[PDB]
């Protein structure tokens, strides 16, 4: 705009005023991290801050990607 602008955020992001600036939330379950080790893949809830068991008794893992709920 003429000497002005808006920090709008796209669909699926609720505007949430935060500390040291404003951001937009995740509009759903807090993100997990996937953490692959040679023998297992581990999950971690970024909000709950707890590991939980996932793929185990494996060997020589190296990299990870995912498809969100295909079915």
């Amino acid at each position: 705009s003429k000497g002005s602008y808006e920090c709008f955020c796209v669909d699926g992001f609720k505007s949430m005023s935060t500390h040291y600036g404003e951001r937009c939330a995740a509009d759903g379950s807090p993100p997990l991290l996937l953490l692959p080790e040679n023998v297992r893949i581990r999950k971690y809830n970024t909000s709950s801050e707890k590991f939980s068991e996932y793929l185990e008794e494996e060997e020589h893992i190296q990299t990870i990607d995912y498809d969100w709920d295909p079915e």
Binding site: G12, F13, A26, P31, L34, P36, E37
Partner: protein, 71 residues
């Protein structure tokens, strides 16, 4: 900021969330392709497995025998 500490066996971090991959991106493929329908800017293209070629005169059907999807 530090989040957490894991094995030197750690090989990735990946955020497992749906907003991370926009699910409402329509596939331009018209099901015309016989085996593979790769993407390209503003459209798609046909291809067939390695060590095979298109049936002469056509850019869709390839001579390699089709295989059933895995259950």
């Amino acid at each position: 900021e530090k989040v957490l500490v894991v094995n030197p066996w750690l090989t990735q971090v990946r955020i497992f969330h749906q907003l991370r991959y926009n699910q409402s991106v329509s596939n331009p493929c018209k099901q015309v392709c016989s085996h593979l329908c790769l993407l390209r800017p503003g459209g798609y293209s046909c291809a067939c497995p390695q060590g095979s070629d298109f049936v002469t005169g056509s850019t869709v059907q390839c001579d390699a025998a089709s295989e059933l999807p895995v259950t």
